[PDB]
Amino acid sequence: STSQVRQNYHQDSEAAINRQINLELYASYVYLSMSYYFDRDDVALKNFAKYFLHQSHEEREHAEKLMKLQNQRGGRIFLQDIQKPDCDDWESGLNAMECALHLEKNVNQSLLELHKLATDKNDPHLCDFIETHYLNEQVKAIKELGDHVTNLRKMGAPESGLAEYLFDKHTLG
Amino acid sequence: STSQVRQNYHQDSEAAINRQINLELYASYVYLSMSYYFDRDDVALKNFAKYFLHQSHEEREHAEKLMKLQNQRGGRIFLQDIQKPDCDDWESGLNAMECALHLEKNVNQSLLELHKLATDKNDPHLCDFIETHYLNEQVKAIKELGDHVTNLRKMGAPESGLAEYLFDKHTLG
Amino acid sequence: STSQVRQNYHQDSEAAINRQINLELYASYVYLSMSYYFDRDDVALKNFAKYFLHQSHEEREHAEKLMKLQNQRGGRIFLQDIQKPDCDDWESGLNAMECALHLEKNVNQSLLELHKLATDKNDPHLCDFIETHYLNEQVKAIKELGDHVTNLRKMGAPESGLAEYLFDKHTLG
Amino acid sequence: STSQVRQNYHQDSEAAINRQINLELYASYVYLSMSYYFDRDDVALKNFAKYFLHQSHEEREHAEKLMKLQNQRGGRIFLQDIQKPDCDDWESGLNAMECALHLEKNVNQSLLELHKLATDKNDPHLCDFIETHYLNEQVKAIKELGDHVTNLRKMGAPESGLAEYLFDKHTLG
Amino acid sequence: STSQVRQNYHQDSEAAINRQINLELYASYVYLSMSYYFDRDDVALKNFAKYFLHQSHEEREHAEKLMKLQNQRGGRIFLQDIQKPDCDDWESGLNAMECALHLEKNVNQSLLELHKLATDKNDPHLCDFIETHYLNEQVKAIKELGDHVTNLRKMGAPESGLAEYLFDKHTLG
Amino acid sequence: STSQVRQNYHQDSEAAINRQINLELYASYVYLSMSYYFDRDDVALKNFAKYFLHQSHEEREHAEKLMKLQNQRGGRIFLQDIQKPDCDDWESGLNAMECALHLEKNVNQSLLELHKLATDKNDPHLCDFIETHYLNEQVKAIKELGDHVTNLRKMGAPESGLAEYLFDKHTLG
Ligand SMILES: [Mg+2]
Ligand SMILES: [Mg+2]
Ligand code: NA
Ligand code: NA
Ligand code: NA
Ligand code: NA
Ligand code: NA
Ligand code: NA
């Protein structure tokens, strides 16, 4: 039953990787929803839409890299349903950025727990995989989203549609 | 409540588009599963894996184009859960190709029903959208998959692992 | 007696590095033997030979990088005899690939023990050296060898000399 | 009070980063002093001066990267006075190189303690930041300085002004 | 005791140069603090940050040129502690620009006193050094900062976060 | 049992080739030891290290060419243990060069005996292989090492660390 390549790869780590794959696919779907919200004719913030579509594709890439990891270690991928995002209508550029920040922090928390598990199972390859490919990416993403939220708020979002317009132009464009 | 851009776009068409979006996202996820099945160390068919990953990304592109359509017409996207694929283990190159063929034919059937609905609602824009972007693509995909299945079977798949090996090299590589 | 550069470098880590150097040199020599086995006129698999010669040189590079590490930390290299490989005749492409897989897993196990020792001695530089330069390399090498073994077996190696011939051409060539 | 981006970043780590920033700025200032010592008309070792000025600028870069880290994690930078270096007159090329070696080892010790703290607080992002950007840099710097000191001593520094002259020309030039 | 190169270089001028070196290093450190204030996630004015970092590096260059002068004339550099800046939190883009203006005017006043001293000691080389490299630079810097402050105030800084946002984009970007 | 390609290739020649392969691998390992001796922080002669590493790789190439010969003639390679070098610490640039000279002369003596054996067995292919690829190489290597030893001695090695320093720079650099 054991893969010929498997070495020092605990069942708990394999299961946690499968959960992280699902979470990354979920994040990609959340960002897809946000993108096309901003593509609505009654929202019409093209650069918000582009920003979130880029994030969606990046999240898909993260999921695929985890799947590649799983196969590299000799674990077996078990996919689950990708739940629909919590919202259909993201209300505003600022609200979407705040939800993105919350999402990225949740993903980061899951990654930190994954690292803790790897450490407990003395899986240095897994630990360094997470460190190299995920944790700094997450820190950067959180910092960027926080900067965006700060700017929107200082500009007067979401009540100032001019605020969101100019942010779309000058920051995201 | 009605979008300022909406014109000659029936509620039934909007709902059918939302269903097609979900179906395309589902197909993308199926192909993703197949790709990483072939990436397993105990399967190890790199070009099968590449082929199905390409298909996965293409299906995502199809879904996004439908979302763009929905917004263009002034309908509203409502996302649903993306169900996990029917299999974790796709058994063989031939079996995966046959399942892909079945999937593509199901997608085609859904597209044909969408066209029929558009026609019944006298929505020529929608009809020609489907015709231009989807129906021929589907016909081509089905023909290609049928050709692949035919070749694998004639070569002796799935019992001839040499068969699948050489198909991976010479057709998909 | 203590090197002017030495800092946070335990005697046990220094000794373990010397053992790893010997192991890497041993692996290089094993791969050299395999390469020239496939260079025999009665075996005559040029691409197997090339593959294993490449691996031999890579293993030498790994050993030299460990020697460089040893000097960087202010430890002292102590070389030992390089034992001859366990076989003169590697029997088949498949058998050689399986022995290579076993060898790479043994090297990986030694690296994991080295990492555990470094961690126990709170030597983060050493830990990250191992993580960055060795562990992922090992995981990749094991995955690649497992893929090769899987393909050869599915093709019908080692009884199908046609199998090995075509693998030599299409995978290793 | 808590930054919107802050996650898994302990107050003790934040304080330790602020201390490391100060230490890096101090090291930059030490190297600046050494550089301009060698720029004196009665010392006149241009390549020593260039070497230490380069080191000064590199140390400033290290400090700024730590400040960037601090902001990325949502900690707050608190700057302190930069103490003047211990010497105005560095006596000789050899003496300056030895003091540089001592300084680099002190910086390394502080980094190791920072890593230990990060580990104790289960801050893998911080650990890997230190590992990736600082620890190997330090090991290299210490090895290089030790090599320089060894060469100067073997050449006959500091009594052989010819020794320092030729080292300036051939190693540092 | 007297340097072989020293000619027409009064002890008072040497001491005043040492004081100016310290002041330039202090200004560099002030600008560094301001830069990383604007790098905070809750401030998030990237172009303010870049502007002040550039100023910090320029101030370092000014200090190093004074050190070079000191050695050229045969004076001896005596470094002092670099005091921490007066603020940790610079409150706003406008407030930081006003503090920068005040700082630059203080530096200018010190330079003017240095010139007066040089003149009194009949040190035309020193006078022209100051004139050529420092005084016009200061005048320009003060004029630029005054222009910035004027614009921010007219735009509605610091209460209009939109004001600072657009200034960051259009003037400093 | 006899290889299909074997012609005019005596068992004694085959055995002597296997011994020469081992000797070449041994020489490679000796040079590797010397290289990393000079890489020590307390020796720190980078160009000595580079010179000996180059020699190590060249010796490995010689061994591989002999293995290729063995297979070309239809003999069978039998590898033996590679003994560790006689020294861990090579004491000085001059001492290492003298040991290298002794080693190269021993290798040359073995080659001359190999040629004599080939001649006695009327194996002109083997004789000319040795002549073309090995004997002149050896003569050159011995002459070069003798020149190096002569220069070091005249310069005052090994007591003059300046001597070795300048030789490292000007001859080996
Ligand atoms: Mg074929
Ligand atoms: Mg790491
Ligand atoms: Na992600
Ligand atoms: Na499709
Ligand atoms: Na290795
Ligand atoms: Na540093
Ligand atoms: Na200045
Ligand atoms: Na040789």
Curated annotation (Swiss-Prot), chains A, B, C, D, E, F:
GO terms for biological process: immune response; intracellular iron ion homeostasis; iron ion transport; negative regulation of cell population proliferation; negative regulation of ferroptosis; negative regulation of fibroblast proliferation. Residues 7-156 form the Ferritin-like diiron domain. The record marks 19 as: Essential for association with cargo receptor NCOA4. Transmembrane segments: none annotated. Signal peptide: none annotated. Expressed in the liver. Its EC number is 1.16.3.1. It is found in: Cytoplasm; Lysosome; Cytoplasmic vesicle, Autophagosome. Fe cation 2 binds at residues 59, 104, 138. InterPro entries: Ferritin, Ferritin-like, Ferritin-like_diiron, Ferritin-like_SF, Ferritin_CS, Ferritin_DPS_dom. One of its GO terms (cellular component) is ferritin complex. Keywords: Acetylation, Cytoplasm, Cytoplasmic vesicle, Iron, Iron storage, Lysosome, Metal-binding, Neurodegeneration, Oxidoreductase, Phosphoprotein. It holds the Pfam family Ferritin. Its main location: cytoplasm. The keyword Protein transport does not apply. Coiled coil: none annotated. The keyword Ligase does not apply. It catalyses: 4 Fe(2+) + O2 + 4 H(+) = 4 Fe(3+) + 2 H2O. One of its GO terms (molecular function) is ferroxidase activity. Fe cation 1 binds at residues 24, 59, 62. It is linked to Hemochromatosis 5: A disorder of iron metabolism characterized by iron overload. Excess iron is deposited in a variety of organs leading to their failure, and resulting in serious illnesses including cirrhosis, hepatomas, diabetes, cardiomyopathy, arthritis, and hypogonadotropic hypogonadism. Severe effects of the disease usually do not appear until after decades of progressive iron loading. PANTHER family: FERRITIN, FERRITIN HEAVY CHAIN. Stores iron in a soluble, non-toxic, readily available form. Important for iron homeostasis. Has ferroxidase activity. Iron is taken up in the ferrous form and deposited as ferric hydroxides after oxidation. Also plays a role in delivery of iron to cells. Mediates iron uptake in capsule cells of the developing kidney. Delivery to lysosomes is mediated by the cargo receptor NCOA4 for autophagic degradation and release of iron. Oligomer of 24 subunits. There are two types of subunits: L (light) chain and H (heavy) chain. The major chain can be light or heavy, depending on the species and tissue type. In the human liver, the heavy chain is predominant. The functional molecule forms a roughly spherical shell with a diameter of 12 nm and contains a central cavity into which the insoluble mineral iron core is deposited. Interacts with NCOA4; NCOA4 promotes targeting of the iron-binding ferritin complex to autolysosomes following starvation or iron depletion. Belongs to the ferritin family. This is Ferritin heavy chain.
